[PDB]
């Protein structure tokens, strides 16, 4: 594949909160600091 623009969003969270990084979720990371759009396309990568 080729991509027209690519952005890496980089940040750190509590291991419980990784579920809030999927699109359309709820909880204060999804609600108040890192919202993904409902039709997100891209990849979510996370590690300890």
């Amino acid at each position: 594949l080729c991509f027209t623009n690519v952005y890496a969003d980089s940040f750190v969270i509590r291991g419980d909160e990784v579920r809030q990084i999927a699109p359309g979720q709820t909880g204060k990371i999804a609600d108040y600091n890192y919202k993904l759009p409902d039709d997100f396309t891209g990849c979510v990568i996370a590690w300890n």
Partner: protein
Amino acid sequence: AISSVLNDILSRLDKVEAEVQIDRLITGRLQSLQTYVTQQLIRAAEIR
């Protein structure tokens, strides 16, 4: 679907699960219309 009422589906489920239940009602309703329009087209030929 879990209900025949769109407001029940939209109040009880989130965006991505409600869009799976609403599509069952769209699919079945749209076939309920296509069946009516087909029997009306077939019956209009008898009246003509």
